[PDB]
């Protein structure tokens, strides 16, 4: 019938691409990994190379340590028994210091201290990776757009596990490391703050989360609809507009009265998605510090 260009018909492969050099310290780049024919049906088949400077090494070490602190506690909670570990994996939880400890680091290892060490490791890992998104762009002379977008995601994480606890005077206010328990905490947080559906910023965050899936459904579909004119080669279409960019713009103008440009739709994209965690972060930061009950706040409004 027609070809929808969702999965490739024929794969083609050539010599591994080592990348652009620009000001990247090449000594810090690994070799090429394998090529996967599976991935190649949907995207590029090549795996690697990866850059691993000192910052990449620190991020991986602290992140593996974050995983290890959580892992060892889970194994302890499982009585070191493999079968118990596997049946209750989603049920285990590394919990914060109890309220009485406030913000001190004097909590016993099994009762808060292990959580503190895990949080330290995740803090270092995430901020190291943030530095790395900045510096890899810098070495290639690119704008710092990824690092700034990553800062919005980091805002929510920072508010949830560090900034709002510190402002509230207690580590018990932060999230546990566990699959079901972080879900329980999320539910409990709404209950305690008088139903988060009345928080104006949670409503906005939701609007931007739904908005992100509306807009990537729209953008992805538009590009594959004009991939028959090389539409996915967006940077040359920005540099020298072709019929793919014109027909893409005119579908939406004829459908809903206004449209984007091949460069401009990526600004709508980064902002739609960034605003999810930006509004979300403000929403959580105000909860408990300024507003104790959002239903009540909603009444005086």
């Amino acid at each position: 019938a027609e070809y929808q260009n969702i999965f490739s018909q024929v794969q083609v492969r050539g010599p591994a691409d080592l990348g652009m050099t620009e000001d990247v310290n090449l000594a810090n780049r690994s070799g090429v990994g394998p090529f996967s024919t599976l991935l190649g049906w949907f995207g590029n088949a090549q795996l690697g190379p990866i850059y691993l400077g000192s910052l990449g090494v620190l991020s991986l070490f602290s992140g593996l340590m974050w995983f290890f602190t959580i892992g060892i506690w889970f194994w302890y909670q499982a009585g070191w028994n493999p079968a118990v570990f596997l049946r209750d994996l989603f049920f285990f939880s590394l919990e914060p210091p109890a309220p009485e400890y406030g913000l001190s680091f004097a909590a016993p290892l099994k009762e808060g201290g292990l959580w503190l060490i895990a949080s330290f490791f995740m803090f270092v890992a995430v901020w190291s990776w943030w530095g790395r998104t900045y510096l890899r762009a810098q070495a290639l002379g690119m704008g710092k757009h990824t690092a700034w977008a990553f800062l919005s995601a980091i805002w929510l994480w920072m508010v949830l596990g560090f900034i709002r606890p510190i402002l509230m005077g207690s580590w018990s206010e932060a999230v546990p490391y566990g699959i079901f328990s972080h879900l329980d905490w999320t539910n409990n947080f709404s209950l305690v703050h008088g139903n988060l559906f009345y928080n104006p910023f949670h409503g906005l965050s939701i609007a931007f989360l739904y908005g992100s899936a509306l807009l990537f459904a729209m953008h992805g579909a538009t590009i594959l609809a004009v991939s028959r004119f090389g539409g996915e080669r967006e940077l040359e279409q920005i540099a020298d507009r072709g019929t793919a960019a014109e027909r893409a713009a005119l579908f939406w103008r004829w459908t809903m009265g206004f449209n984007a440009t091949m460069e401009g739709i990526h600004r709508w994209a980064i902002w739609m998605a960034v605003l999810v965690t930006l509004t979300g972060g403000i929403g959580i930061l105000l909860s408990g510090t300024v507003v104790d009950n959002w239903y009540v706040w909603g009444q005086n409004h």
């Binding site: 090549q46 049946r87 990537f216 579909a221 600004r267």
Partner: protein, 281 residues
Amino acid sequence: ALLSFERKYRVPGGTLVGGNLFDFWVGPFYVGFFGVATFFFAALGIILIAWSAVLQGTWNPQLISVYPPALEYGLGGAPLAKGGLWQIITICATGAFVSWALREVEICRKLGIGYHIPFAFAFAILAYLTLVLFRPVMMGAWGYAFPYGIWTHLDWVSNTGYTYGNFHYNPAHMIAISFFFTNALALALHGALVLSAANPEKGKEMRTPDHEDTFFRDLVGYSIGTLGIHRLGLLLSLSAVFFSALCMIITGTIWFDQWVDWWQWWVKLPWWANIPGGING
């Protein structure tokens, strides 16, 4: 009013219904048979919402709320002010949405492009229709659907959620959330990558795809490519809505209790089921 390059595309043809009769534009908007069908269904649905507002005794945006037929009616008709009006507005809504998708198909036909956007929109229409048609019919009553009101549909989400405990424990809801979160992540990243290359450090030459691939290769050791990221985006957002629709159409039809209890099937598995320790022993 046309864009600088638009005239050459405004040709005849592409209409699915009624030949050239509705083949024209009002300002930027294309009309077509499905353009007038969306205007009819949208207008009648809005007039019926205004009439439900009149009957409810309010004109306030925040307070207007059209409710489904209360459970006694099952899947039968209802008096207009007690659920009948919802039923008609639902017909109008389905009609306006399907017409919007079919209008998009006529615009695709005139522009010679693929039908990917109407196809993707159909998933959101099917999600709406799961909550309003498929799950109510499978459950035996229209009252299980949501109210058409800004704050009241949220009340519906909350009550429906809590009938099954913390709705987070629904496994298909978990998958749906994962796709929404990953979709927003990917969107941020794609926007950021095309923009970092098109707008390099001040004074440098515009970067190329190769630089996008090398940035992501240096950062995470893979680059899905420019075709792949758009393929991925469409798939993440569509899978998010599919699993949303799935998590609801199973709730109330084949699962009736607290969703947290589902997870016990894995715990009660014979070989580890009775070992003391952990969280469940």
